[PDB]
Amino acid sequence: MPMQMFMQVYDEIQMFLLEELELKFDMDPNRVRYLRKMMDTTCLGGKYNRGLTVIDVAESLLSLSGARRKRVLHDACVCGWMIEFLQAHYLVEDDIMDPDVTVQCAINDGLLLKSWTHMMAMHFFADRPFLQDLLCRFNRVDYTTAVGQLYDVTSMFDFAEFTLSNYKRIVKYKTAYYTYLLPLVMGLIVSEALPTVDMGVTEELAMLMGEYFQVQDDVMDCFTPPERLGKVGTDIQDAKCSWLAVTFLAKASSAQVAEFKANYGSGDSEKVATVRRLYEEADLQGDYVAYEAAVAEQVKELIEKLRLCSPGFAASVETLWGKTY
Amino acid sequence: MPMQMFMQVYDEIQMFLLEELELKFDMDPNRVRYLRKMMDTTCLGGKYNRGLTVIDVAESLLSLSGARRKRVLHDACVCGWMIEFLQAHYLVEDDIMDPDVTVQCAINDGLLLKSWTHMMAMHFFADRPFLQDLLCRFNRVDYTTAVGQLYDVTSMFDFAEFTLSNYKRIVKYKTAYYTYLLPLVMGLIVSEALPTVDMGVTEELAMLMGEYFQVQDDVMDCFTPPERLGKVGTDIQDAKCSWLAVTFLAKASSAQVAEFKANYGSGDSEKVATVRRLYEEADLQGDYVAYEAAVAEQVKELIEKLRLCSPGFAASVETLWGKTY
Ligand SMILES: NCCN[C@]12C[C@H]3C[C@H](C[C@H](C3)C1)C2
Numbered sequence: 315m316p317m318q319m320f321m322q323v324y325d326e327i328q329m330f331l332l333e334e335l336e337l338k339f340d341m342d343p344n345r346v347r348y349l350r351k352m353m354d355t356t357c358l359g360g361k362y363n364r365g366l367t368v369i370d371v372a373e374s375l376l377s378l379s380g381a382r383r384k385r386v387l388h389d390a391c392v393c394g395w396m397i398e399f400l401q402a403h404y405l406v407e408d409d410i411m412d413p414d415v416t417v418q419c420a421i422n423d424g425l426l427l428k429s430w431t432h433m434m435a436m437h438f439f440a441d442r443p444f445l446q447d448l449l450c451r452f453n454r455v456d457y458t459t460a461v462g463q464l465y466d467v468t469s470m471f472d473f474a475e476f477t478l479s480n481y482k483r484i485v486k487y488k489t490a491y492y493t494y495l496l497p498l499v500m501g502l503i504v505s506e507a508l509p510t511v512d513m514g515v516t517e518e519l520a521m522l523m524g525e526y527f528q529v530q531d532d533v534m535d536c537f538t539p540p541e542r543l544g545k546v547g548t549d550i551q552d553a554k555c556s557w558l559a560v561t562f563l564a565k566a567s568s569a570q571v572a573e574f575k576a577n578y579g580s581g582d583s584e585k586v587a588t589v590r591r592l593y594e595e596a597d598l599q600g601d602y603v604a605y606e607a608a609v610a611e612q613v614k615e616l617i618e619k620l621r622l623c624s625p626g627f628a629a630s631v632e633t634l635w636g637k638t639y
Numbered sequence: 640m641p642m643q644m645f646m647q648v649y650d651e652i653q654m655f656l657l658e659e660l661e662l663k664f665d666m667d668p669n670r671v672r673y674l675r676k677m678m679d680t681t682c683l684g685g686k687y688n689r690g691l692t693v694i695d696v697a698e699s700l701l702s703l704s705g706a707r708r709k710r711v712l713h714d715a716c717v718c719g720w721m722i723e724f725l726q727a728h729y730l731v732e733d734d735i736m737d738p739d740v741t742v743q744c745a746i747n748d749g750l751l752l753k754s755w756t757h758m759m760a761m762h763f764f765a766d767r768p769f770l771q772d773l774l775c776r777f778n779r780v781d782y783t784t785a786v787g788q789l790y791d792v793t794s795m796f797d798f799a800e801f802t803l804s805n806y807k808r809i810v811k812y813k814t815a816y817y818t819y820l821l822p823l824v825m826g827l828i829v830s831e832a833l834p835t836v837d838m839g840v841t842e843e844l845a846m847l848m849g850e851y852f853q854v855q856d857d858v859m860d861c862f863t864p865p866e867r868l869g870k871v872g873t874d875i876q877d878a879k880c881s882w883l884a885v886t887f888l889a890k891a892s893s894a895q896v897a898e899f900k901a902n903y904g905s906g907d908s909e910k911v912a913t914v915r916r917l918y919e920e921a922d923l924q925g926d927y928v929a930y931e932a933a934v935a936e937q938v939k940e941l942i943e944k945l946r947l948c949s950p951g952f953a954a955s956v957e958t959l960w961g962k963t964y
């Protein structure tokens with residue numbers, strides 16, 4: 315029922331957007347089918363964890379507070395696709411980062427994908443009291459993410475910034491807000507229970523879960539072989555401010571730092587291997603286990619303060635945490 | 640007073656955005672001064688016709704309807720910078736269209752410039768009744784523009800689309816809405832006189848003025864020498880669906896069309912010259928004078944229907960039309 319309802323609303327949303335282009339923007343059939351294909355390509359095929367989290371938060375708060383149920387569940391599905399379309403937008407912008415009409419069209423796709431989040435919200439929520447508050451929180455998180463991307467992309471320019479506090483600054487702004495905080499908040503807004511939750515504990519839980527997720531992602535990026543990871547690990551070659559790099563630099567010897575600094579940020583297979591060798595000598599995959607355990611305990615503790623005053627909200631945050639854990 | 644007040648609010652807006660980054664987003668000084676420089680580079684140096692039009696519409700509707708005056712004029716300046724920042728955003732995206740951190744940063748700049756339009760509106764209008772209606776109309780026009788860019792960029796793929804109705808479809812969506820309609824509407828919203836105007840005549844006037852402007856721009860792009868135009872004309876080489884191309888194809892002989900089709904869309908200086916030669920033989924610069932006269936009359940007529948029920952609104956639309964004429 316969750317995933318099948320999510321896809322049914324996707325069809326309903328795509329139909330509205332495409333017909334709006336045809337009826338109001340004078341779009342010809344050829345371009346409408348092109349945008350249908352582009353929309354399907356960029357928005358489908360993932361796991362929908364962000365979008366399904368909105369649904370899971372909504373179903374809890376209506377059962378643990380008949381016609382209002384159908385409306386709140388449908389809104390949740392629309393909110394979930396807003397975040398999924400937002401995610402599509404970011405991925406397209408990341409592809410560009412890696413008279414050419416294919417680049418013109420990718421740029422155009424990125425803009426349309428973002429605009430579609432506004433168009434679908436201005437339609438399906440036109441008569442909701444929360445439309446303005448929803449758009450403002452959504453836009454604020456999107457800005458947050460663009461700021462986190464700036465931090466990420468410049469973290470090796472101005473190793474001074476290879477610190478744990480700065481790594482958390484990147485993770486929180488670049489990933490945690492739109493991936494963990496925004497799905498929860500949007501489920502609260504469609505359930506009209508926004509002021510009934512402690513946003514401090516909720517923000518802290520989202521920051522922690524995104525941190526937990528990003529550290530595991532950083533370690534897998536370096537040690538998981540390409541065919542099992544789903545991609546080729548690129549953090550070392552790209553000089554990324556990863557959890558491994560910042561943890562290494564704090565426990566490395568002076569000449570190990572010299573060997574790291576001379577090898578980091580290169581595509582040469584042997585220097586990349588030298589970095590992997592350095593990481594293993596420092597027992598970083600052992601520190602990784604301990605670090606995730608500590609965060610996992612901090613997550614396990616903060617969920618209980620949340621349930622003291624917001625019981626039903628907490629079960630979905632546990633469901634979301636299990637998707638990460 | 641108009642331009643000096645517009646720049647004073649720019650300083651006030653920049654200060655709020657940068658301090659917000661420092662106080663709320665944990666941004667370090669080095670990156671704040673970088674974003675100050677980026678903001679100044681992309682947003683200043685133009686003519687501010689879009690932003691100053693909002694001011695000119697606002698000052699008319701308060702004098703031709705003490706504390707309310709200062710508020711409406713300040714709002715207008717903020718609305719004007721929203722459009723100017725939106726214009727900065729589009730120009731940066733156009734530059735991209737023409738592990739590289741300069742491309743990463745340009746992409747990031749484009750996203751920030753757009754987000755800043757939301758951040759500055761959610762701040763300075765947080766207590767205004769029109770905040771939601773403003774954001775929805777602004778977002779709709781931005782979507783319109785992305786759609787017009789799609790039409791523009793694909794007009795030579797799928798010469799079938801080299802038609803006058805399609806040229807007007809590009810101009811209207813790609814340029815006219817955000818350059819001519821949006822400044823007028825935003826002046827109406829800060830003056831709270833939105834339902835007091837005939838939006839049909841207003842939309843038609845904006846479409847016409849953007850058409851008038853774009854035809855003159857197309858002709859100058861081809862015949863005005865580079866040092867006098869401010870740039871190198873690129874429409875022929877890029878196979879653009881220009882006013883010259885669509886007007887030529889309707890009055891050309893079969894072999895002149897064959898000579899056009901064989902020469903259009905190339906960077907070879909001699910084929911570009913062959914296209915310019917073809918354009919002159921068809922007396923397109925004479926048809927250009929007649930065409931602009933006809934539109935100019937249609938503009939001169941529709942401004943009077945607008946003043947019948949909306950007198951003060953019409954003087955600013957005349958001021959805006961004079962900026963084009
Ligand atoms: N390397 C991935 C290429 N896939 C693309 C998917 C989508 C957005 C971009 C432009 C096209 C449509 C092709 C990137």
Ligand SMILES: NCCN[C@]12C[C@H]3C[C@H](C[C@H](C3)C1)C2
Pocket residue numbers: 677680681731734744745748
């Ligand atoms: N060809 C023009 C280069 N100017 C730039 C201005 C602004 C936006 C982009 C990235 C930098 C900051 C450099 C383009």
